[PDB]
Amino acid sequence: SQQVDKIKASYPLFLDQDYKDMLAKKRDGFEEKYPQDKIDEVFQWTTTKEYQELNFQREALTVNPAKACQPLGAVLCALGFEKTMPYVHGSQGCVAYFRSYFNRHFREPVSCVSDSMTEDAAVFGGQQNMKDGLQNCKATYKPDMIAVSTTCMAEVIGDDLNAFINNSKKEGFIPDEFPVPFAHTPSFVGSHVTGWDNMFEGIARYFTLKSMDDKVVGSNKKINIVPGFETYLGNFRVIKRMLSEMGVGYSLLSDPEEVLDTPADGQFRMYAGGTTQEEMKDAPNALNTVLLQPWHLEKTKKFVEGTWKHEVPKLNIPMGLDWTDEFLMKVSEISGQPIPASLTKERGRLVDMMTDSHTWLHGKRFALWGDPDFVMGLVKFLLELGCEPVHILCHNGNKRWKKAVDAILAASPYGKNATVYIGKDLWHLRSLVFTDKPDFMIGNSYGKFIQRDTLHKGKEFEVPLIRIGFPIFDRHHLHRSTTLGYEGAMQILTTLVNSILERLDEETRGMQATDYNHDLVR
Amino acid sequence: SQQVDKIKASYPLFLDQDYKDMLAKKRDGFEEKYPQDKIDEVFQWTTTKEYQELNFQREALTVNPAKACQPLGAVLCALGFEKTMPYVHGSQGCVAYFRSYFNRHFREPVSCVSDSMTEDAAVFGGQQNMKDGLQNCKATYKPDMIAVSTTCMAEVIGDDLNAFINNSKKEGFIPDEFPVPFAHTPSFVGSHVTGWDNMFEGIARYFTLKSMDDKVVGSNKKINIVPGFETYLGNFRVIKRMLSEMGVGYSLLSDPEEVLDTPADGQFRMYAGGTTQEEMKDAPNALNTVLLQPWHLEKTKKFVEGTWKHEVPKLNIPMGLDWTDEFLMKVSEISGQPIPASLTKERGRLVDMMTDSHTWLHGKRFALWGDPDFVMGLVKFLLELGCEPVHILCHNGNKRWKKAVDAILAASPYGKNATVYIGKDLWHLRSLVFTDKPDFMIGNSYGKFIQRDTLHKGKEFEVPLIRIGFPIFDRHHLHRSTTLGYEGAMQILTTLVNSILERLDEETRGMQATDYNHDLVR
Amino acid sequence: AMRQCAIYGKGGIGKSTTTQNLVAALAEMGKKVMIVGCDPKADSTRLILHSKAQNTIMEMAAEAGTVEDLELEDVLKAGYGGVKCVESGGPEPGVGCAGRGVITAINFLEEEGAYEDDLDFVFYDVLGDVVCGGFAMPIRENKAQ
Amino acid sequence: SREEVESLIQEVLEVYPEKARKDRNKHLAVNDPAVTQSKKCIISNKKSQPGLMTIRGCAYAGSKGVVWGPIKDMIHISHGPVGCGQYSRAGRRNYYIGTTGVNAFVTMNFTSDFQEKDIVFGGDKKLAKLIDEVETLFPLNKGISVQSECPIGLIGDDIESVSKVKGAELSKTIVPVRCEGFRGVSQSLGHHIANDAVRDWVLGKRDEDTTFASTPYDVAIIGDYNIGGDAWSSRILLEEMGLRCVAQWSGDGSISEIELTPKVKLNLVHCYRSMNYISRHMEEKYGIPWMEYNFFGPTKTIESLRAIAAKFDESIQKKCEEVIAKYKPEWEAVVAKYRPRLEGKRVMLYIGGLRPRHVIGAYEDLGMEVVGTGYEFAHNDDYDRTMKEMGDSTLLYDDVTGYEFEEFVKRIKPDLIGSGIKEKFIFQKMGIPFREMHSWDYSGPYHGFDGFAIFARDMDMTLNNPCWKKLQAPWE
Ligand code: CLF
Ligand SMILES: [Ca+2]
Ligand SMILES: [Ca+2]
Ligand code: NA
What we know:
- Chain D: Its cofactor is [8Fe-7S] cluster; [7Fe-Mo-9S-C-homocitryl] cluster.
- Chain D: This molybdenum-iron protein is part of the nitrogenase complex that catalyzes the key enzymatic reactions in nitrogen fixation.
- Chain D: Tetramer of two alpha and two beta chains. Forms complex with the iron protein (nitrogenase component 2).
- Chain D: It holds the Pfam family Oxidored_nitro.
- This is part of a larger assembly, with two copies of chain A, one copy of chain C and one copy of chain D.
- Chain A has four domains: 146 residues, 3-Layer(aba) Sandwich (Rossmann fold), CATH 3.40.50; 105 residues, 3-Layer(aba) Sandwich (Rossmann fold), CATH 3.40.50.1980; 83 residues, Nitrogenase Molybdenum-iron Protein, subunit B, domain 4, CATH 1.20.89.10; 106 residues, 3-Layer(aba) Sandwich (Rossmann fold).
- Chain A has 21 helices and eleven strands.
- A five-stranded parallel β-sheet of chain A has the order 9-8-7-10-11, with helices on both faces. In chain A, strands 2-1-3 form a three-stranded parallel β-sheet, sandwiched between helices. Chain A has a three-stranded parallel β-sheet with strand order 5-4-6.
- In chain A, strand 10, helix 20 and strand 11 form a beta-alpha-beta unit.
- Chain C is of the alpha/beta class.
- Helices cover 32% and strands 18% of the residues of chain C.
- Chain C has a five-stranded mixed β-sheet, sandwiched between helices.
- Chain D is α/β, with parallel strands linked by helices.
- Chain D folds into three domains: 193 residues, Nitrogenase molybdenum iron protein domain (Rossmann fold), CATH 3.40.50.1980; 143 residues, Rossmann fold, CATH 3.40.50.1980; 115 residues, 3-Layer(aba) Sandwich (Rossmann fold).
- Chain D contains 20 helices and 14 strands.
- In chain D, the strands form three sheets. Chain D has a six-stranded mixed β-sheet, sandwiched between helices. A four-stranded parallel β-sheet of chain D has the order 3-2-4-5, with helices on both faces.
- Chain D starts with a helix and ends in a 13-residue tail after the last helix.
- The chains are: A alpha/beta, C alpha/beta, D alpha/beta.
- At the B-C interface, loops of B face loops of C.
- Strand 1 of chain B pairs antiparallel with strand 3 of chain D, so a sheet runs across the interface.
- The structure holds FE(8)-S(7) cluster, calcium ion (2 copies) and sodium ion.
């Protein structure tokens, strides 16, 4: 039943007595459900060290991964180019998923096409799909460039992107001069960030490989900036703001900030902003190229160093105090521009915030996950805050990256209780937060199920989630945030200390029980 | 007892069994405490409509006010002028409180002096305190200006600021040309915002009253902006950013943003930035003067309109969509500068956010309090979001202001269940959230005690607090936020929808009970 | 537009009579005027109202929880030629500062919207025997130019 | 170097006009542990010079905020305009157990919110009506106090009459306190005014009542406002020692405990400054002796437990040693962990009237040295108890000025500073670790053995925090 002036949605509608009795009867009569005491017993066992050991020896089963597949990254990279349509050669199912995944995180349209290869292409390849596909796409959506990547089906059957595109052009399906950069992006190799790297290097080689004799390093007086897989709009923005603030000429290669944030003014803009084709062509002429997320830009780095001849600086992602300082100093060194008073003051304001909040942050324990560069930047800043990054998980991380992170940790007393995990998933992390309970978890929306699981053991075992990363689907507009630079550090610091204070307020809200510590001032 | 490797602070230390037994014995043996069932009975009675009626007929007692006294506002206003030292003529206790109050909100030093009038000044006045005070202050702290206000003791005994300062100069305690603007700021009249208005008009008259024959309206081509009592650093900032973005010449009269946010770089800066004396002298030469918080700038308005001859525009505080649009259009009209593409796009981005979050915001009920301009701006934006502002409380509001707010409400169907209360305090508001329960409260830190109170009645009666206003002492760095313009609307919208989603996640986190609605995507 | 005037003078020399006839003459010639009595004797408006004694703001304020409990309607009365009349009144004999009582009353008129945008003149009839800081407050507070 | 300090003082004083210079020179001194009569070296408890930015508060803060505010089951009215009560609402962490707004009222702000008409006509009738309203809406309050703000005495209100009349009418204890801010020269007179108000309107209520069963081990904790739980972590030790704590003045205190205090056998004074007044009175009137103690750090706590136990029979002295043996391994573990991290570090302190000298032992238990200390409003009997606790040639400052404190810190260069909220952010910007020593920086308790662990942890987290190595941009 419903009271017209107080309509109930699923929650709390199904809590009504008649629904509750109905669900009880459904269970008892037809679910042949395990007895509740048995369920409690197994649940408890899943929180033990014995279960954790069995959990960590898994070799074939993966549960609740913390990574996605290559083409997702290729699509995001492509989205950052002017009037460019991401095109994934292969099965269409993948494209419905890539779009939906980004639509929920950015709460914005996400354009991408597929050439719908089906069972009759599984045997002889998708050459015809590519011919008709490129023609239909250019004609229908009028992009000025089509960036091609692939689904696993096309990779497994061996479709040759280069040949397929050449033939499409040779036979007139699309103009010979129409830009169609491409990249093989197998989902069974690496992860979504690997797809970004592959797609980027593919677009870079398309516009510069054959014309390097025309380039002169440093002739355009700019600094190229390659962002990598980035899902926070404030990150593209803060980098451009700091560089402009320094009077540094630059070129952001793959800039999706405009297309991932169009205004709702009466018209739908399929395309907006983005790195121009001319900027890619001219890139070799820059003074140098800075990679913001080097751990997932290795192929791009080999091409930029080996072909463009840029002395790519060995810089970590600009997250936290030391690394933002290093990024600015290097940029200053390469461009010849001094670091201005405004940035020096911004730095000092972040330090002020750190001195003001250090007492609540000191010794707080965290479990965290995400992509490699983001995870190590988070780890570095946590150390700078006097916090303890106990469970560091990067499903798509690698051995060399782990060694680097272990070195960062060894350089700080606050890194003594930390352990870096690669190849492990969120089901592994779940055991860690039960056996060696931290104070909070810093991760994406999938972490909400772990919080729910810990609360079930008991309120005192609950590990609250602090949402930073990708994807974030259960909160609105956090994709507008910033995690890079002094601005990103201020935002993360504010989020961490207030998450601590919110939880403390929750624990001291008990009238005449725990409210003796429900302080007005903190 | 303590475990050296897991030290416990008050919470949860006192939860240990030995402390718990000790507290039980203290109570039973010497507190002659009312029986727990009697305490429950009275608590319950305090949540009823019967108690609410008795509560609303109070005529002499005030409980948990939502306003402060005049000089607090005079000090904040003074703090916004270059190398200016706030000086409060009267009792020193007041100054220890004003500083501490702002120190806890901004987490920054707050400089201000007193001339320590004591009992022997209560009979014959504080003329000597003023002479020695101004001399000692100028000599010791070297300000270029001393802005004088007063404590209630000086007001009650009738000290004549004008005469006291004139004599201090006449007798050589401070240079005759040394600027010493002043204002009487009685704590028993209006509130802290009235003190801001009084102090501002005092400084404005000091620099322009006697030289008006030298002024020509519009000769300097700028637009003056008077901010009023403002405790969010992002508000001073967003106004300057939007005006500069429009290419509009302007002058921010009382700008404390630099002094309330100095960097921690090794040195303490007692003074920083601020409106210059030259800017105050030149102010009458502007095209016009815009008051950002007109409801507490009435005395300033009379002086600006009557003496400077500026046609002060009838504009509401620039909060929410419509009012930010109006502010920009008026500024565009006065300066002749068009509204640029960047601002038009920012507007459209706020509208996009509203369309994306409207389903979670629709019909949400709120209780809220704060200063008059801030409160009406919050009310207007809530209406724009499709929310219902049920309990609107402004302790320091007035009848004309209430009529204006009632008109804003009558202009929207979403304002039908709203009631505006003036002269009422947070004890009155507490009854309202128990008798006509809203979904959330939007207010300052004092609201945490109301949330605690509602939780005691039951988890289903708990009204969570959303912190926006002043002062905010139990969370860190929220004073860096923005509530004005499109930027402030985006921040408030994000905070409101995520407060709703956080609470929904809390209510659906029950394993096999309410988690059927613990959606990964919202 | 609106001019703020104050009539100051010793008591016992017809000052209130002259003030009310000056005001009646201005109303007669078409001006919008408001008379605010600021004499503890509260006899600045009887001739305009044809009354024996107008309830003062101070009298009514002492009976209430807060001054805002008062309604302009009981305080402000229209008399001859439409001129508006108010009496500040004073605190009880021997206790308050008569001057602060006058400022309290004027501040109330301000908040209550008594100063219409219509008004051409506002005349404060103030006592000027002993010119103490109290009776000089309308000057110190720019209540009248 | 004594010479260097004397010279620092004179250099700093040079910025002052003549009058302020001569006066301030008497409130600054170089310590001499041999001195017993502090007046020979420093003067105190005098008015503050105008415009110098004293850190001091007023008598209202000393009465309402310090002494009376903490009594949990009484309703305290901040009588006068809205300011005072709002700035002091829940700013001091005087902890208590209760159902706020029902049987306890510490964190609430009750006020008569004076408007202009209240100044003109006086607020006695408003006060009387306010009291009836309090009685109607908070029926479980067990007494009311009237904390006068500046205007009360200035306009001639008679709050004593109102309290007497309404008190008899309602058969309720109503205490008028003349703590107007213009009285005295700091928070100090507020304490004295408050102690006298307790004495005159509350303390003798049970003078003729013999229903309280007393034991020979009954004591009262005098002068511990339970900041962050300080009194509870003190109380636990005294009771483990076999004593019975009848009352706590006034942290987590009830009006009944106060009224029961005249039945105790010994008054244990922690804060000498704020409550020596009522202590002397109880000895004079009831014959109850009182003694000073210190629960800051293991050395002082052990010494205090032993001195207190010596006042009772052998059974208490035996339990005293059992309690000391129980905690020995706990504080030794705290020292073992933290002293090596703080050994040799120098601290400069500036607080109110007790802690500036009372915490020295705790710092020394961690191998730290207090190179400077001073009080906002201490009297000379406080400095008499201070010089012997401080090292030779250390700096002392009474009612220090903002300017002075900053200059002394720049020269001395302490590794840590322990002061208040108005001082905190100034020094952090200078890169000097800072710990609030009034509010314990929202941490605590610091009293007793359990409090020592927290104190150590706190001094360490702040002094050795990684943030202090980052104030200088590397391009500088
Ligand atoms: S020394 Fe006097 S008792 Fe002390 S704190 Fe000052 S007021 Fe109060 Fe002031 S803060 Fe404002 S101006 Fe009056 S109301 Fe109150
Ligand atoms: Ca959107
Ligand atoms: Ca700060
Ligand atoms: Na009842």
